[PDB]
């Protein structure tokens, strides 16, 4: 997620508030091995394991 | 040899410093570079250019002029113009804050911690200088910032170097056009502070220069691009005698020892008479008689005073170009015979003549015209009493009703200075009335 600001520590009613956002900057690409690329015979790298 | 030191202050100052030094460069053939074309002139630093520039062993021409300002705007602009390479870097001194039209702010709150470097620079020019005849100060009495600072630094020079002359060339507060309400305040303060350390004073007025501009240069849309150029021509005329050679030469020493009658009063007025356009000068004639009649024409001066409501006592005529003394004396004698001119008795003669055979110059991209004969007039009169009368019957009302005084009592002063200034001015009027009395 991407929180915007916290207005809680001003006082103490809950464990503070978590205002959201609407543009989600900084979402960085990390692809992951899904079910698609699976077959008998292919290449898969596993932290350096060919 | 024969050299002076130049000081400009204020956004109003760098205005006319820019214009005047740009004019300066042409006649000595100074490209914005600082080094000359093929023909060799450099040496022991000894030829005409030396009187304004100090061409070092580098070959670059480095002016003996200091530009001090408290605002980064105009100093950044001038340092980003075309002529930037010439100027000495920290001879161009800048600050970050303004006096906000407050003379007290400009003299007290900020000026203290810059005059130290000012002193540094001025004495490290004075050491190298040789004759050091005089100072050339450029400011404005209605200074938004450059008033108090200028007064303080001229006081410091008065207390440290008590031998040379001090020349002031200021845009006087316009009589009936005022850019703010602070002008009577700052003007009266600066005048009453400087009355006893100033040596010779000249005031000019933009309204009158405007009237000339659309009277005989007949262009209704000029700007400072015109006005600063004209006043720069005036200063070129007043320094030609020191610059070049001539038949008979006259020095600012004599200017001081002659044009002032007696102490306190050191406030004459100036005029360049043959301000005329290219086409006009092209297809009409020029000679001594008409230009002298013009220089006595009252509407071509630069302060709204009526000479027939005043009276003359001093005149210094500079002729620049080709003349001979015979028709000179003819014309001056004819004017003396003429009657409407009202000489005070005390001067039987009042004329000092300075002739410099070199003709004045013309600037490319300009609107002036080819000149073979030019007359510059410097006369002291009594006609300017109306100016001080105006300013006092202005300031009285504001002192009566106590407006804007909070701004000043906040920055840390009292009303003693404000009061004392008006009796100083009153002394000025009483003395002028006495000298008008025979």
């Amino acid at each position: 997620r991407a929180v915007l600001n916290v207005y809680g520590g001003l006082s103490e009613w809950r464990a503070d508030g978590y205002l959201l956002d609407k543009y989600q900057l900084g979402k960085v690409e990390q692809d992951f091995y899904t079910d698609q690329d699976l077959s008998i015979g292919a290449t898969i790298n596993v932290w350096g394991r060919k | 040899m024969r050299e002076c030191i130049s000081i400009h202050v204020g956004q109003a100052g760098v205005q006319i410093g820019n214009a005047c030094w740009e004019l300066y460069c042409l006649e000595h053939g100074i490209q914005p570079d600082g080094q000359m074309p093929s023909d060799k002139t450099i040496g022991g630093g000894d030829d005409s250019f030396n009187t304004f520039f100090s061409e070092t062993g580098a070959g670059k021409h480095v002016p003996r002029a200091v530009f001090v300002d408290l605002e980064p705007t105009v100093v950044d602009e001038v340092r980003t113009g075309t002529y930037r390479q010439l100027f000495h870097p920290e001879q161009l001194i800048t600050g970050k804050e303004d006096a906000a039209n407050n003379y007290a702010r400009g003299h007290y709150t900020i000026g203290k911690e810059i005059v130290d470097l000012v002193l540094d620079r001025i004495r490290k020019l004075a050491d190298l200088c040789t004759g050091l005849q005089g100072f050339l100060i450029f400011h404005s009495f209605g200074g938004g910032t450059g008033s108090g600072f200028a007064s303080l630094l001229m006081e410091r020079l008065s207390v440290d170097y008590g031998k040379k002359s001090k020349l002031e060339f200021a845009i006087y507060p316009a009589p009936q056009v005022s850019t703010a309400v602070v002008e009577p305040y700052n003007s009266i303060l600066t005048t009453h502070t400087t009355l006893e350390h100033s040596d010779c004073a000249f005031m000019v007025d933009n309204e009158a220069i405007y009237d000339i501009c659309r009277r005989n240069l007949d262009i209704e849309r000029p700007t400072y691009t015109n006005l600063n150029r004209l006043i720069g021509q005036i200063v070129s005329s007043i320094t030609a005698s020191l610059r070049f050679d001539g038949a008979l030469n006259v020095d600012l020493t004599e200017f001081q020892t002659n044009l002032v009658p007696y102490p306190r009063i050191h406030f004459p007025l100036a005029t360049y008479a043959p301000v005329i356009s290219a086409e006009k000068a092209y297809h009409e004639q020029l000679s001594v008689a008409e230009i002298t009649n013009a220089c006595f024409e009252p509407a071509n001066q630069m302060v709204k005073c009526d000479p027939r409501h005043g009276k003359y006592m001093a005149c210094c005529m500079l002729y620049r170009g080709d003349v001979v003394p015979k028709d000179v004396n003819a014309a001056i004698a004819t004017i003396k015979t003429k009657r409407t001119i009202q000489f005070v008795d005390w001067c039987p003669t009042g004329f000092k003549v300075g002739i410099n055979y070199q003709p004045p110059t013309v600037v490319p991209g300009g609107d002036l015209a080819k000149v073979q004969r030019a007359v510059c007039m410097l006369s002291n009169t009594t006609a300017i009493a109306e100016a001080w009368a105006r300013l006092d019957h202005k300031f009285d009302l504001m002192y009566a009703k106590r407006a804007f005084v909070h701004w000043y009592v906040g920055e840390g002063m009292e009303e003693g200075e404000f009061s004392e200034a008006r009796e100083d001015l009153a002394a000025l009027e009483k003395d002028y009335e006495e000298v008008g009395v025979d």
């Binding site: 207005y7 001003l10 205002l19 | 906000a100 850019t179 000029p222 407006a403």
Partner: protein, 427 residues
């Protein structure tokens, strides 16, 4: 060097700042994203008065946005320039306001103040030297008054050497919306007159009139209103960031403009307004700029000074003019009506001339005036407050908050003092 930090207070000031900032940025050539596009040397230099510098050429505003309603700041962030604003300066509370000035001034502001003070002093130390602060807020809106009064009060003794340029919107003399507006406005103006030095007061009735006069589209939005007011403040700020043979500093203006400590109220005025077809039916000439500037219909802040008289005026032009035309125009107005001003002071005219015309035209202007014309406005609020106070309706909330009606009495006293001194001066 000299910079400015902006305060964007209460819901009004929030959208005011939205329009204002996008206007400044769009004139100054920065994209919505953040990657400037090289066109203009001079803006590229003087950007530092407002915008600080991140890496890569992406510019952080020096503004602080505050409000209590999270949805307001959600919408502001949703606008095309939330991405040019920072979460760092987004601070907010949880409770709705109700636009109760006592609420804004004693209970929840009492703890909301500290954090905003800490953040603003962070940025104030980050920069080098400010001249003051410009505040955008409301006096008829609850949270703006209740918070900004405390804020200005405390910053006054934080740093006693800076200019409190204040920009407060004024309720309609024909419909006050918030029924407790008399109370809010009186309480707010009580501390306004003390802390502030210069204040611009803005009423939108004239905006509606001008929408029927020159905007001429009859189907407007508060966005268009913000367009106009943002342009006006742009004009007042232009002189600093641009060259020219003029003086720019707000202090250079104020010390010239105000004669006495208790004179603070000011009248924005604008320059050529162009209609449906006046574009190709108009010649933009010095006489007509002067005329339209001085025009009464053109005036849009409070009301016609026709009933009263002027004390001081200042005008800032922006274009390739000359000094002679403005001087002769000043003489023309002076001698056309040398009666409507005050014989006390001469030369009531103040001038500035910038050489950097705005984007889209070649010469423009802006007019600010101090005239004895706000008497009717605060007189109206006087009758409002008295005619309410005679039967203390709605006062149970304020008493439950916990103050006294005596404080109200001193507020009305100070208000009547302003009335009396304006009258006693002009007459």
């Amino acid at each position: 060097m000299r910079e400015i930090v902006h305060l964007q207070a209460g819901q009004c000031g929030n959208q005011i700042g939205a329009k204002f900032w996008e206007v400044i940025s769009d004139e100054h050539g920065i994209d919505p994203t953040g990657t400037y596009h090289g066109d203009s040397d001079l803006q590229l230099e003087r950007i530092n008065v407002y915008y600080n510098e991140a890496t890569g050429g992406k510019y952080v505003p020096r503004a602080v946005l505050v409000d209590l309603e999270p949805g307001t700041m959600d919408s502001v962030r949703s606008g095309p320039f939330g991405q040019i604003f920072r979460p760092d300066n987004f601070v907010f509370g949880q409770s709705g306001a109700g636009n109760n000035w006592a609420k804004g001034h004693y209970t929840e502001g009492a703890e909301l103040v500290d954090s905003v003070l800490d953040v603003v002093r962070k940025e104030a130390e980050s920069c080098d030297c400010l001249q003051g602060f410009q505040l955008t807020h409301s006096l008829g809106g609850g949270t703006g008054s209740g918070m900004g009064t405390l804020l200005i009060s405390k910053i006054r003794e934080e740093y006693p050497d800076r200019i409190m340029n204040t920009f407060s919107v004024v309720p309609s003399p024909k419909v006050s919306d918030t029924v407790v507006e008399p109370y809010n406005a009186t309480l707010s103006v009580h501390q306004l007159v003390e802390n502030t030095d210069e204040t611009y007061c803005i009423d939108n009735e004239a905006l509606y009139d001008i929408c029927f006069r020159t905007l001429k589209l009859t189907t407007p939005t508060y966005g268009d209103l913000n367009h106009l007011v943002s342009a006006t403040m742009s004009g007042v700020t232009t002189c600093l960031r641009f060259p020219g043979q003029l003086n720019a500093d707000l202090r250079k203006l104020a010390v010239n403009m105000v004669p006495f400590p208790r004179l603070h109220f000011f009248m924005p005025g604008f320059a050529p307004l162009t209609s449906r077809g006046s574009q190709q039916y108009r010649a933009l000439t010095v006489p007509e700029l002067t005329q339209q500037m001085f025009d009464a219909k053109n005036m849009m802040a409070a009301c016609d000074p026709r009933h009263g008289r002027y004390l001081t005026v200042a005008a800032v032009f922006r274009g390739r003019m000359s000094m002679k035309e403005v001087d002769e125009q000043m003489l023309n107005v002076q001698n056309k009506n040398s009666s409507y001003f005050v014989e006390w002071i001469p030369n009531n005219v103040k001038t500035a001339v910038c050489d950097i015309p705005p984007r889209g035209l070649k010469m423009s202007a802006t007019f600010i005036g101090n005239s004895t014309a706000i008497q009717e406005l605060f007189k109206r609020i006087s009758e409002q407050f008295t005619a309410m106070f005679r039967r203390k309706a709605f006062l149970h909330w304020y008493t439950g908050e916990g103050m006294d009606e005596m404080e109200f009495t001193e507020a009305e006293s100070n208000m009547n003092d302003l009335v009396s001194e304006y009258q006693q001066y002009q007459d």
